[PDB]
Amino acid sequence: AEFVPPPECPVFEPSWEEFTDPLSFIGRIRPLAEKTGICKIRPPKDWQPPFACEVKSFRFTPRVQRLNELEAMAVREYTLQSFGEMADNFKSDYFNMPVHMVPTELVEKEFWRLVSSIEEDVIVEYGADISSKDFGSGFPVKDGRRKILPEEEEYALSGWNLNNMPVLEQSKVPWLYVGMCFSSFCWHIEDHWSYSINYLHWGEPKTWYGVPSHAAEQLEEVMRELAPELFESQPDLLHQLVTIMNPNVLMEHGVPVYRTNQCAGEFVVTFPRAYHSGFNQGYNFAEAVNFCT
């Protein structure tokens, strides 16, 4: 049987008034969004920050990802441009059609088939170990390292600029993700059970799955039961390097799971102790940071 898509997580389209303060808005949506673990936030139509990374010098060596590495129980340097050419060529060749014509439901169905396939070994690459300190943030930042036009200053000062989120807990910079088709991140929660906010600067959508915090123990129970026994006794911080699991398996065991396709220009917020995972539909560029309330 083919993959059954989970129900859609909440999507919010705040007015310009509601968009004034992120923490205030997230606090207001909390009664609903914390019951779904993840939610999507569409900024007002005219809110479009520029892309502010140093594209000329952007170079990275992505990690290699074997989709079926659990069921089965190298390095290339790219620029942003050459990675995008590799990514589009991979997807268009795999589906035998232009990249933008591949339905999101098909990539989703094919991704989870490949994760459990023993007869087909598909290998992709993910630019996932990129700090915003290396080549700059995707958002404009008034740090003097790169020019900012007057029309872009409001985005350098915006509270939705991930560089302006509060990160100090009572008793940290954004990270970048250059994705291709089938590149993925497995089930995990954040350190200190922190919130996280994620912005897709451009490219094809990023598909998400989320579990509300009230079902965190249920997920971890299903994991220890079905995860490889060799990795059963591993600490959570190490096990969550390989906590790959089909969302339908969690749903069969009574774990509530919600999905969304995060498109370019949209935010995804993960709530405290909300397990989440996902994959990229194609060539895209995301920025993420953990924040405190």
Ligand X SMILES: Cn1ccnc1CCO[C@H](c1cc2nccc(C(=O)O)c2[nH]1)c1ccccc1Cl
* Residues of the binding site: 126, 188, 190, 196, 198, 206, 276
Least CB distance from residue 87 to ligand X, whole Å?
A: 14
Tokens 């949209």 — which residue?
A: 266
For residue 183, give the 3-state DSSP assignment.
Answer: coil
Nearer to ligand X, 101 or 230 (CB): 230
Q: How far is CA 19 from CA 41, 64, 155, 220, 238, in A?
A: 10, 38, 13, 35, 37
List the one residue from 16, 241, 252, 253 that touches ligand X (CB under 6 A).
241
Give CA–CA dist 163/10, Å, rounded. Answer: 25
Nearest to 57 by CA among 79, 82, 41: 79
Judged by CB under 6 A, the stretch of 20-28, 51-59, 79-87, 185-193 that binds ligand X is 185-193
Q: Which stretch binds ligand X (CB under 6 A): 24-32, 131-139, 184-192, 245-253?
A: 184-192
Q: How far is the CB of 107 from ligand X (least distance, A)?
A: 15
Q: Is 128 in the site for ligand X (CB under 6 A)?
A: yes
Which one of 198, 213, 246, 290 is in contact with ligand X (CB under 6 A)?
198
Instruction: Evaluate the CA torsion angle 225, 236, 242, 89 in order and state its sign.
Output: positive
* Site residues (CB under 6 A) for ligand X, limited to 61-90: none
Among 83, 111, 126, 283, the residue binding ligand X under the rule CB under 6 A is 126
Give min distance, CB of 208 to ligand X, in A: 8
**Helices (runs of H) and strands (runs of E) counted in the chain:** 8, 14
Start-to-end CA span in the chain (Å): 42
Given the rule CB under 6 A, which residues bind ligand X? 126, 128, 177, 185-186, 188, 198, 206, 240-241, 286, 288
